């Protein structure tokens, strides 16, 4: 703690603590060069700028060729991960691909790359194409908007999928040949397990080990993640051999992250918000004089525009010219070409000032435009929601996170910024390629700073949320037919990620059994009981308490196929009726649980009002209710 805070500044509005940049790594190792590779692998790095691998990569690489084993990398994800995955891919290709005969063996190996987001999948795919073009490989996307069919999967070799669509592809019974063919299963951002999509990954993992026992040849599993505690427990979840585990701290990061907080001493929201804006302004003023390109995160998208307006009138009151003093002719040109043409959320004026913003709710084209302009650097300041850290790789020298309380429809309450989101926001930083270090900043209330220091140290385990997704996963598995009884269910649950975590800390995750049942037999079986009661109530699976026999129903099969959540499922069950009509169909569709996170907005409200007058299919609900918004959007 004491080494972390070096220096603290006290200011009238706020008390700011300035953490120094992390230490540079000790060298016990050799930087591994490219000429050490075999013949075909030397084009793995077609542009070899250093001709030597980064501090993280070399050791993990030679270990990766040396062993064929399940591996885990907890790393800054400083662009180091992309190349490592590429290299393991090339190894599998060489194992199925002869060194002498240069014909690539296409039908032997199959590869899967699990990237949480569609956009990041896209980016990855272009990377894999660039690096793998010399072998003559088809690298194509299996997920979502990708829209690959029954055939192209067979044709392709390397796959880049999102977790959801990969889950649904491997869940289906007919394709199992492809699943067996895949030798190489790469999991990017295994730290996702903390978040509620992570349940899908652990379910996929469980299916890989447990579900294919009739062919029974286990594929190579490579986890790739941001640095996280309880790495050992992660390995015990997967298989991981002790040597495959590589834990690298932030000292191995390309640009050391200078951590900074401002505690806010104010309480009432009207002065508190003003104090935050003042602090942000002060930071921006310190940054831009150094020629620093800056990002300011916020909670909500509506917050972005008003924040940028505040920076325009305030920042401009201070000095107008300095933001663009250079190439003002070309800045006027490019700015008018971009802003004036495609933008229509009254965001053009912000672009024109040269403080822009990016958020969900900005047009897809406008969105790409803002990214590009901020890359060129006519945009000095970029106000953003949480989309960028999660999605896009583009780093920016200074990163400010404004505020604590985010509203989550999960609770229906304002919670604190969750650590897993904070960390990935801090990830985008001073550019590893160009700049030397980053500036992280967190605009926050002082009382919660004590919390953010620790959670920002990344001492927090990847929390297992399997409790919510357990039921649906179990149903899908019964549909596969792999579980005929409670004992089978708990054996599958032994390879489940919550199992490990329970073993580590039973009372944290509410194991009553504790001393009893070291293997948590009765705890596992009790969860299965709990699941199969509600499933049976939803007529998803057949179950009997004392006799214990399991079988899958038609509704359960449907939920498995289209990956409907169990809540959505029972909603359909009751709300659909014999006499239900066209009006009620849209209402039920709206009621689908996947829209629970949807809510009506005040900038949306005028267009909603115009719609619902002329809407052909009537709405029983009203403008204030999100369901009505959903089904009118459906009509549109």
């Amino acid at each position: 703690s004491l080494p972390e805070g070096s220096f603290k500044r006290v200011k009238p509005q706020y008390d700011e603590i300035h953490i120094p940049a992390p230490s540079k790594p000790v060298i016990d190792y050799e930087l591994k060069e490219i000429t050490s590779l075999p013949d075909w692998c030397q084009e793995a790095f077609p542009s070899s700028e250093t001709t030597s691998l980064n501090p993280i990569q070399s050791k993990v690489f030679h270990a990766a060729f040396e062993g064929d084993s399940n591996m885990l990398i907890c790393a800054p994800t400083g662009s180091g991960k992309t190349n490592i995955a590429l290299l393991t891919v090339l190894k599998a290709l060489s194992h199925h691909y002869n060194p002498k005969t240069k014909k690539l063996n296409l039908s032997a190996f199959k590869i899967v790359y699990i990237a949480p987001l569609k956009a990041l999948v896209q980016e990855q795919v272009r990377e894999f194409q660039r690096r793998l073009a010399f072998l003559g490989i088809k690298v194509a996307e299996l997920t979502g908007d990708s829209r690959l069919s029954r055939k192209q999967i067979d044709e392709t070799q390397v796959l880049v999928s999102t977790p959801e669509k990969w889950d649904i592809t491997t869940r289906n019974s007919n394709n199992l040949a492809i699943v067996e063919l895949v030798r190489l299963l790469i999991i990017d951002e295994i730290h996702l397990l903390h978040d509620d999509r992570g349940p899908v990954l652990e379910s996929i993992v469980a299916r890989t080990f447990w579900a294919s026992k009739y062919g029974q040849e286990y594929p190579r599993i490579i986890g790739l993640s941001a640095t996280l505690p309880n790495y050992e427990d992660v390995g015990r979840f997967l298989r991981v051999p002790k040597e495959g585990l590589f834990y690298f701290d932030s000292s191995f990061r390309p640009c050391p992250l200078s951590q900074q907080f401002c505690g806010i001493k104010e309480r009432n929201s009207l002065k508190k918000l003003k104090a935050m804006n003042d602090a942000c302004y002060e930071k921006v003023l310190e940054s831009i004089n150094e020629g620093n390109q800056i990002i300011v995160f916020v909670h909500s998208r509506k917050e972005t525009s008003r924040t940028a307006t505040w920076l325009k009138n305030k920042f401009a009151e201070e000095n107008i010219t300095h933001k663009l003093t250079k190439n003002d002719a070309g800045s006027k040109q490019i700015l008018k070409t971009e802003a004036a043409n495609v933008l229509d959320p009254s965001l053009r004026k912000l672009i024109e000032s040269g403080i822009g913003t990016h958020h969900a709710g900005l047009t897809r084209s406008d969105r790409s435009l803002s990214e590009d302009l901020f890359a060129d650097g006519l945009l000095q300041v970029l106000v953003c929601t949480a989309t960028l850290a999660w999605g896009v790789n583009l780093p920016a020298h200074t990163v400010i996170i404004k505020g604590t309380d985010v509203y989550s429809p999960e609770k229906g309450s304002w919670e604190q910024l969750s650590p897993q989101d904070v960390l990935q926001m801090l990830g985008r930083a001073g550019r590893p390629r160009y700049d030397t270090f980053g500036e992280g900043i967190i605009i926050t209330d002082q009382s919660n700073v004590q919390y953010y220091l620790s959670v920002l140290n990344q001492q927090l385990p990847i929390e297992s949320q399997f409790v919510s997704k357990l039921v649906d996963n179990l149903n899908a598995e019964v549909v596969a037919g792999n579980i005929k009884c409670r004992n089978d269910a708990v054996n599958w649950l032994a390879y489940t990620y919550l199992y490990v975590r329970m073993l580590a800390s039973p009372m944290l995750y509410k194991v009553p059994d504790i001393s009893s049942d070291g293997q948590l037999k009765k705890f596992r079986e009790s969860l299965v009981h709990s699941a199969l009661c509600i499933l049976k109530e939803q007529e998803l699976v057949l179950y009997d308490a004392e006799n214990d026999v399991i079988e899958a129903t038609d509704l359960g099969n449907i939920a498995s196929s289209f990956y409907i959540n169990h809540a959505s499922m029972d909603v359909y069950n009751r709300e659909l009726d014999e006499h239900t009509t066209q009006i009620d169909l849209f209402r039920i569709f709206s009621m689908s649980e996947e829209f629970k996170y949807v809510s009506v907005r005040y900038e949306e409200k005028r267009e909603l009002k115009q719609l619902l007058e002329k809407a052909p299919i009537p709405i029983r609900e009203d403008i204030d209710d999100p369901l009505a918004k959903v089904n009118v959007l459906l009509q549109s």
Binding site: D405, G412, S413, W414
Partner: protein, 49 residues
């Protein structure tokens, strides 16, 4: 919760120390703030002092 904390024949409420009350009062405030919202569909966090 704690049977070791004994209501005498004299008193109504059980005898605690101060800090035990300090926690209990928070636990009691929790029921109020959760059920007011839960009944009225109102989020706890957004409430002003």
């Amino acid at each position: 919760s704690d049977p070791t904390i004994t209501i005498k024949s004299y008193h109504l409420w059980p005898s605690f120390t101060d800090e035990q009350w300090i926690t209990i009062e928070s636990q009691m405030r929790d029921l109020i703030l959760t059920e007011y919202g839960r009944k009225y569909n109102v989020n706890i966090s957004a409430l002003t002092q």
